[model samples]
Every structure is written in structure tokens, then in C-alpha cells.
Target: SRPQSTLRRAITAAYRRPETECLPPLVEAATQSKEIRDAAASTARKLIEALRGKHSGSMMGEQFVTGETIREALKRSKELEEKGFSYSYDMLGEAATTAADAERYYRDYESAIHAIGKASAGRGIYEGPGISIKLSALHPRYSRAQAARVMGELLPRVKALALLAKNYDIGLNIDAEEADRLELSLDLLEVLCLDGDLSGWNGMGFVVQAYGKRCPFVLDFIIDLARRSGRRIMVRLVKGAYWDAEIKRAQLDGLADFPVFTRKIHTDVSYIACAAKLLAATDVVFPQFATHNAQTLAAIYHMAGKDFHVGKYEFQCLHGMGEPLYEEVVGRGKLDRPCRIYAPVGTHETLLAYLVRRLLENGANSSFVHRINDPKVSIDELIADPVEVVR
Candidate 1:
């Protein structure tokens, strides 16, 4: 690993370039106008044409897409399971523009759950593989009251479906959305945690983005809430998603800073340190360390130690972002440190937002920059691959 000081400088240099530079034409095309949008579409088509089919017969060395379907994903997952890996599916969609949209999303989720339940409910059929969901997808416009109302109507179905998963032994993970909606989404989740009867086997988890200023406090609050209620909680800790937008949103609201510690390095190191703290705590909090950062993973691994058991913690990575970290962790045979993958599933028609974000994020290289700009590496191959392909 390179020295900390040196890595910080490199990251600072990389981030200095405007994020728009990294984005594909599609993102730029998504302005308030249509002409620019058409131009962006042209650029994206050219880019895809140039890159597609270059690495055929491989599970996306540059592209992370397995197949845009649950069936196809399960097929890919079968390969990983043979290698002793496990997975959770994410139904990728985002921010509903209205309450009606949120309701429609809730209905979609209802269908998804029943289908998964049916698929894995048979005796000895390892289902769940698991599921991840975004709150914004519930209500992109996200009126707190309306969001809560949607959750109120949907929670009963969710709880009932959660029971199906529990019966079949599937896990459910609720993801954090934009920073602005964090608290509202969290409140809705807490209601579920506090109100539902998960039967201790319902693998329902919530994510806490480490990049948010309020994360530590939020973590503390959750831990304390669990302790006070005498229940256990699992939190998936990710560095964060929405960055440029998060900062802009904050600025638009007339806030000073977004409460993020420092950019990449500071955030990654901080997350690892926080993970160590969380793992060491005796409270009934199981932390899923969601990162692609090898250094941070290694640090958590070293801290967790050899012969660690999975009863307390685990590692998580996104579906397309394949890394040897899965093999390495599973190979270690830490009973308490099993690995989980975020295998997202949904129709191509509904996944446009996710597809867009994947493009934007890849163009911006959120995780890529995290790896290459880290001090732990002297050089990283500059690969021009779609975010979905690279995995």
C-alpha cells in the first residue's frame, strides 16, 4: 500500500476534474432540454457499439450485467454458490416522481416478494438468495407524510412477505437513497424493525451510508434503540452513493457542508475504523461491510481475524462488481464472516433509472476512483468499461 499522505494527494487530484468529464453523453443529455438529450443518446450508442461483444463468453470483465432477469441472475449465482458464495437480489429502480408512482412501486415489490417466496418455498430449495430496495423508488418525490403513508399501506404486505422469506430463509435488505431523504426513510425502516415480528429469522436489514455526516449518530441511535428494545439489528454500512447530487442538494437547501468527513480516502478509512468499532461492540448489531475497497476489506478482515465466525458480521458487494474478495473471505472459512452479494433483479423497462445511475456512477468512477486513488496501490489499470461490465 502506498503511504496515506501520497494517496490523499492523488485522490485530491483526481476529484479536481469536474464529475461531468467522467460521465457519458447520456448524463449530459439528461438536461432540462431535449436536443442535448438526443446528442447524449447518440454518444452513448456509439460508446456501447464500440465496447459491446469485445469480451464475449465472460461474465462481464468490464460490464457487470449478468442477464437482465432473475432467471439469468440465478444461473450466474449458481456458479458462485458452487464456489461457496451467497447472494441477495436488488430490484433496481429509483425516486418515484409522485405518490401514485410510489404506490405502483409498492405493488411491484409485492409481486416480486411473492414470486421469490414461491420460487424458494419448496423444501430444501435455498431461496433468497435475498433482495435490496431503495426508498426513493417508493416515492421519488418523497413527501415524508406520503412516504410514510405508502409504507403504512405497504408495510403489512411487506411484513407478511417478510414472513414468507423468513419461512424460506431469505434475507431482505433496504437500501438508503439520496442524503436528503435519509432520515425519513430511516424512520420508516425503524417502524418496521420495531413493529414487525421477524421471528429472528427474517433477514431484514437497513443500510447506513458512511459518507453522511449524521451516520455515526444514526448508528448510535439504532444501536441504542435495539438495546433499549432488546432486539437485534443488522446494518449494511456503505461509503455512500449520491455524492455530487448530495452536495448540490445540500447547497440548494442553503446548508453549509453535507457533513461528509473528507472525500474518498478519509471516508474509506473512516468506514473501516467504524466497522471495527461496530464489530467489537457487544450489542446485538450485525454489520454488513459493503465496500469494494480492497484495503478497507483487508483492514476489516485483519481486525476480524482468522477463524472469525459469521454469527456476528459478513462482507457484501454489489452484483456486477465481482472481486476476489468473495473467494478470499469465503476461503478463510470465518464462520461469522460469511460473504453476501447484492444481486439486483427487475425488468429492463423499469430499470431505466438504475441503468442511468450505473452509467453516471461508472462515468464518474465512484468505486473505480476509490480503488485506483487509494494509497494502497501504486498503479491501477485505467480501464474504460461500463459500471455493469467491469464486474
Candidate 2:
């Protein structure tokens, strides 16, 4: 029988909780104890501020985001590059609410691309640092409902950036957004892929989320898309970031079920399954496994097999959360697989919202990073086979 029943029970048990249960009736204690209330309220404010991470002095933001500016990020990447790590730079500001905002992001991306492209200096995509761009940042109406506007207004912007990337011979990955926009983005991917101006560049890239129920089949579409275009696509396989939003969206829309797996283990199993497809499709796609999970990393590392090359496949992790794990993977007698750091570059004003969102993503109880931090979870449990765990 599927372990889903037990999983559901466990989730149901954990789903019920409240701060009052953990707290010692602080409101009543404060009323009776007078001055104690002021200190308690002060302490509470500090805790809330810490959680919000809304200051330039925040340690939380620094850990997740790379730098305050493009130059600062490059300076840090050059330092990390010296330590044998590659980088993919992402500007922090995104999803323009206005046409002016979109244009600013476009110019920002253009400047950053040129800076990164020059730094890349013809070392090519695999070894040199690359830039990741979001379609929403290129257009305010980057939605399925406005497909015509996106195709007309956004396509030219993306094509121009890609052309610039091609001229510099640096990788330009089209970052994935919402699930609904996946197919819409693919239309642009197909356009850029087969474009005569960009043919033979092989530096163009795309991202696929492993958590989606439609994941493997989406890979199927992309694999064939690459094959038909006669070009190699740099595909970054991520464990999907918008899980909470996806869940709420499913409930809001009153859909049949979630578009993503309801359980973390299921997502892990799906990751391995999709990884197999990617490893098998290495001929037409450069697989970039972007994860912070030791178990997920180990599974893909072994699944990729013995023979290896710079362009065959690689691993990726977020800027701040990945270095320690990657240290053991990128040395002479180590795992010897290169790990690229996905660095987000911007000021605190542009980065705090993203930083808080990251905290929510990784702070979840089922998240591997959180579990791995718990002393109660053993190594074997942390690396449990999802196939066995699921059934």
C-alpha cells in the first residue's frame, strides 16, 4: 500500500497548532505583573523584527542574497570563482507592476548582462558566469491572458537580450515563474531556440520545476523541443520555490487537486525520476541540478554515472546556502562535479521581499534543509529512498 495514508495522517496531526498553546498566557501575565509587560512586549517586538528581517543590518538577508549591487556580486563571484565555483547572477528586482518598471528592469538586465558578459570574456557558457532573466521583468503583462501583448511586446525584448548574450557567448537562462505561465514561456523558448540569428549559440537556457505534477511530461516537451531545434538546451532542474502559493491557488480556484505534489517525499521521488530523464537526455540538454538537499544531490550525483565532462551536467545551489555542501563536491579527489552558485544581486530595498519569501520556503517543517538541521533526524532518515518511503 502507498505510504500516503500514513503521510496524510501525520500531516493532519501537524496541521493543528497555535502560538497561545506555546506561550504562557503572556497577555494575562503582563496585566498582573505591570513592568514585566513592557519588557515582554519589547522582546516580542525584537523577535518580530528579526523574523521580518527588514533592516540593512540584517544577517538573514546577507545569508540568502549575494550582494547589494552587480559590481559587488561580481567581486564576490570572482572571489568564489577562485575557490573553484561558477556563478549565475540574478538581479533582485522583478515582475514589473508598470511599463516603466519593466523598462527599468530591461535596462538593468542589459547593463548587468554586458558586465557579466565581459567578465565571461569568451570563456563560454559552461565555465563562465551567466545571467538569469525573468520574462515578467521584461513586460508588465506577462500573463496567459495577455499572450498576444507578451508575444508582441515581450518577445522582442527577450530576443534582444538573448542576441546580446549570444554575441558575448554567455548563457542566458529564461527563469521560470508561475505554473500557468510555463507553456506561455515555452512559446518564447521555441522562438529563441530556432531563431536563425541565435542558431548554434548553445548558450540559451531554460528552467524546469521538479515539484509540478506536469514536470516529467514538461521535460518531454522540452527535450523534443531541443531535439527538433537541433540545439543543446541548458536545463536547470529545481525543486520549485512557490509551493505555498501553489497550494493556496489550487484551493482558491477550487481545482480538482494540486498542480504540485502535496507531500515533500513525493516531490523528491519526482525529482529523481525527472533527473533520470535529464541524465538520459544529456545529448541534447545540459542538466543543472539546483538543490540544497544532500539526499537529492547524492541521488543525482550517482544517477549521472561515472563518465563526466564540463558540459555534460552540473549541480547548482543558492548563493548563500550552497557553498559548504559544494566544497566537498568540487575538488581533485572529491565528487569532482562542478557546482554553480545561483546568486541574486541587488540592494536591500530590492531584496527584502525575496529574502522573506526564501525564509518561508526553507522554514517549512518538511523542507530538507530544516530537517537536516534537526538532531532528531538521522542520516539514513534524511536520505531515505523516496520510492520506499512513498510505498
Candidate 3:
């Protein structure tokens, strides 16, 4: 090798060193004696309590989410709001079972919508913080087979919530559930958008998962819905959650194919391509790009071009976990992009399930959020083009 190439390679080798550890003596001593021991003990306590279907201390609850309830969560979140960040509050406890369960969840949702709407302060959907609700929580059986029941029982609750959001001038988003619930939710979306009461308001929104096989078609449907109804729909494009279950579900049901992409790269590719489609239809749809990966975010950020209007498009991320990453993206001095925090709100009781999912997603080796922070993963590997390596 040439001398120059040898020097450059040596520098790269030194920079990529992952085994080296630098520690402050006192800090290391404290970590070993106190923090590490407490962390171990805490893990043991949590594992023991996890099986009881009960919650223990409120340690991770307030830290993971804003608060146990929207009432206090809003107050807790004002710090970020003051610092130029926006948020959408998600109420936990959506795993409803019986009719009684749905009723209680409906009440909880009603209360949450009211609180969120008032807190929005007339900022409108794009700039203002909003709320996300799942359809399954509103009715006991929110499936296609029960279309009439879903429409009869569930439709009115959604309409009331939308109307409430409308009168308050805040955004109310219907969150995506299982793949099977997609079309049924769109049925409701079709009615809601065309409804005379819901007309003339651009605050209504929905989430579209990029992992779905029909994502681009779904976006086309949403865009066409926006055009047909003359309503500007808010669209939050997400990589997706609930990957593992969707796989087994298709297998168990004897389906020929899964509704979502099997590999992470395909979903990442799906995210960017769908993002392009969303960016192109900005006039009819307000895009909210929800992603933790810098590569994905940067791809969308660049594709969005120089017109950085909050009304056109904004970014979104989970609360607590994504704040640090987004803190840099939100300000004008940074990326000149706007980011909204998807803050989940619930009590310690409802937080366990949510927390576990977050852990599972964050701990996975293939997860960008997990791997991007590791020193051993070279920048070349970290930033590999998702779409480029497809062959």
C-alpha cells in the first residue's frame, strides 16, 4: 500500500476502536459500588413483579411517558414545549376486551381528548400538539366481519371525538391497529372525511405504517380521499410497530402472505418511497415523518427539499426516548425541520405493556435506534443505504 493509504487506514482503525474504555476514577467507583448494584436489584424486582399482571413502583412510568394521566402529563411536558418542541399525547390501556372494557376505554378516551384539545390552544393541527386514539379501544369488536356493528356503535364515538376536536380546533388522529383493521378504519375515514359536520376542517389525521404491503396504495387512497372530500388530511408515516405478532398471525390463519414486510430494509425502503409520495402531495396531506433512524430521517429531510414550512410537513418521535435526537432537528439553527413528540400517557398499571414493547424494539440487534449508538458499528455500516443494497 502507498504511505498515504497506510496512514489513513491506521487513523480509521484507531477511530473505530470499540474495546477502549475511558472512565473517571471516582465516577467509575460510584458506578461499580452503587449504580450497577441498584440497577441489578431493580431488574430483579421488576422481573419478579412482571408476572403478577400488576405494576410496582412508578420508576419507569413517569420517565418513559410524560405522566400517568394527561392532566399531569401536559404539565410535565411544558418544559419541552417551552423549548420549541411539540407533542401528541397517546393514552395507554388500549387492550380492551369485553363490552364493559370498551365502555371504560371510551370514557377514558373522551376525557383525554378534552384535555388535549384544550391544551392545543388554537394552534391548529400541524403546529399544535394533538392526540391519538385507537379504534379497537372504542368498540369491543372493531373488525371487518362486524362492519355494521363497528359502524353503528363505533362510528358515533369517533364522530363525537372528531367533532370535539373540530370545535376545539385541534388535531385528532386515528392510530393504526392490526393489519386486519386497516380497511375498516378507512371505511370510517371515508365517512368521517365526507361527513358534513367534519367538512372544512384539516385537523383530522391518521397513521400509515410503511411496513404494510399496501402502503403506497394506502397513501394514494388517503390522498384521493383528501382530494375527493376537499380536506387536507394529516398523515403520520411510521416504520411500524407490532412486527412479530403480524408474522405468526398470518401463519396461524393459514394465509399465503403476511400484511407487512418481512425484512427491516424493505420497510425502510417502503418508508422513503412512501415519504416521497407524501411530500409530493403536500397540498392535500400534511406529512408527519415519525422515525428514529438518522439515515431514514435524513433521506426524508433532504427529499423534502428547501421549503421548510411547518404547515407542509413535520417530523415525529416517541417521548423521552427520541427527545435528545429530535432536540437538534426542531430548531431553526439545526435542520430547520419541525418535530412532534408522540408522548404516551397512562398510569403505572398501563405502562408495563407499553414499556415492554419499547424495550423489545429498542433492544433488538437489527434496530437502528439500538445499533446506531454502539461504538463497534462503523459509520459505513450504520449509514448503509437501505434501498441501494436490495439486490
Candidate 4:
């Protein structure tokens, strides 16, 4: 059994009430050096600009701007399939706060359905590439019911998308958003799973972030929920994003304080171990271990074993996070364990979200342990080139 102290401490430290001492020096150095700030900001702007131009307009390389043109995304997806990798397309934006935005997002769902059909056309196993999406991206603001309404509006599109993907073979995945809205979103997912025509594990799934204090409870709930629903559940297990927001919200709301997981190494290990336990328990509910850590991913394979169903259990990762891990995991042909890259294609300015998250993932203050384990890398290395691969 994993130690509760390790899990609690790592998560608590990562998202504590307020940074009294842990963050000042780093903040001071960054703010004091105008040169460093200017350089970093400039580079980030350029990268975002390039990504926006490449994907928002054209389909080339790993970049797939899904909402631009379904056909273009499908075309690029074929390239990934050819490369022996799988796909999880995220329509390139977050939740809309207005009714107009919600309507626009529902239309994007329509576009996604069209793309799924074209992408699934020529694959051998013929399974649909999973699409990752957020509920907030569908609606706007902090309103759960409004979010649910927007999600409900998309149910017709969700069924159509599932059907379209079933035609060529891609599945749709709803992403895990903020902590406050998680349960409501999961309930909405249940409705979709029950009524949206996802069946026989044709790639339909949802993400569960392990860093949440309620993660284990959620896993068990999903397990029982799936059993009652009489549907095999497909899950993508991530450590989680939005820890900072979660903790801040908890304090602001005067709710029970969020236990902070400050130790990065411990959180990484905790996620790996939790994922392993989840995967080991059920074969019907395929779990996609979304991570870049070799050690963590190795735990996935070790638990999955030699002849496990590859399609069911996948290795999901971000575009720029862990390149070598993909190579190593795919190298092991026995499992047929495909890798799904969550691709974000949007405007240059929008890329600030991704970049900032990456910074947090590797930041000294977060519970991402890999950054601390590597002796060769220094804080200067982190500050200098925050975008470089961890290896």
C-alpha cells in the first residue's frame, strides 16, 4: 500500500494556502532580471505565433487545428497513424462565458464528428482515435448547470460523433476540468455514455486526474458506476493540472482546506502507483496512463504485462513533454500499447495557457518530482530553457 503521508505532503506542498517563503526568491530573480523576462516572453510569443499559423490555417506535421477544417485534421491524423501513434484531438480552446460562445463550441463538436469519420477510414485495427475535450470549453464561467446545459446541447452531436467515428473508427473523450465542476461533469459524462451511443470501447473515454484528494474515491465510484451502467469504461488517468487554481478556490470559498502536495518526486510516484493499481484491477475498463515519466510509464507496462490488450491500455502524453518515453514504450511491440498525444492548436496568445502550465509542471514549487531527481539540470536550466525535454 502507498503511504498516505507521501501523497498528502506532496499534494499539500504543491497547492498550499499561500506561498509565504517557497516562491519569493524564484519570483524575485525572474522579476528583477528584465533581460530574462523579456527573452522568455519573446520566445514564448514566437512559438505561439508559429503554432497558430501552422495549425489554424494548414495541416502539417503533428499540428492539427481541428476546428479549422475537419478534413485537414483527419489528413494529419492519418500521418500519426502511419507513424504508429494514436491521436486525442482537443478542439483548440477553453470554455466560453457567453451564450454565443457556447453555441460556437457546439458547432465545433459538429466539426469534430465530421473529422472523426475521415480520420478512421484506413486504419487496420480500425479503432477510432480518441478526442479529448473540456466541459468548460463548451460553456462559460463557474456555473455547473450552464456547463451541463451546454454539454447537453452537444449530446446529439456527441452521438453523431460517436457514430461517425464508429464509421471510420475514432472515439470521443471528455476531459476533466476544474475541481469544483468535476462531479457534475462526470454525471454529465454518464448521461452521454448512457445515451450518446458509445459502445464496445470504440475509443470513448474520460480523464481522471490523480492529484485530486478525491481521486481514489472517484476511481472506485467510476468502477461501480460503470458496472451498474453495464458499459465498459475507458479512462485516461492523469496526475492533474490546475492544482494552483484548485487550492486557491478552496481557500477563497472557505471550504475544507486543500491538502497541499509540495514534494514533486512524491506526487509523481503517487500518480504512477495509483494508475498501476487502477489498471491492474480491471481489463474491461481500459486505462490510458497519460504521462511522460519513464519510471511512471514503466510501472504501467509492468502492471499491464506482455499480452495485455494494447488498444484498451494506452500511453497518453502531451506534444512536447516526453519524446523519448514514446520511443521506448512503442519499441516494446508486445503490448501494442498505442500512444495518444493531446494536441493543442490555437492562436499564439492562447498558447500562453499551455506555456504557463508547462512552467508549473517543471517548476520547483510543484509536486512534479522528475525535475528534482535530475542532478544534471539546475534551476538556471529551468529558468533559461523551460521548454526543453526533461531527459
Best TM-score goes to which candidate? 2
Candidate 1 lDDT over 263-339, as tens digits, reads 45445444644575577653567778887554455446545545455446777876665344355446544222467
TM-score of 3: 0.82
Please list the C-alpha lDDT of all candidates, in the order they appear.
0.56, 0.75, 0.73, 0.56
How would you encode candidate 3's per-residue C-alpha lDDT over 28-64 as one tens digit per residue?
2112223333343443233222312232212354567
lDDT of 4 by residue, 91-115 (tens): 6657577768766766776677566
- As for TM-score, the candidate ahead, 1 or 3, is 3
Maximum-lDDT candidate: 2
TM-score of each: 0.70, 0.84, 0.82, 0.70
- Residue 333, candidate 2: C-alpha displacement in angstroms: 2.2
Find the 10 residues in a row with the least total lDDT in model 2: 22-31
Better of 2 and 3 by TM-score: 2
Error of 4 at 38 (Å): 45
- TM-score, ranked from best to worst: 2, 3, 1, 4
Candidate 1 to native Cα RMSD, angstroms: 13.6
- Positional deviation of 243 in candidate 1, in angstroms? 0.8
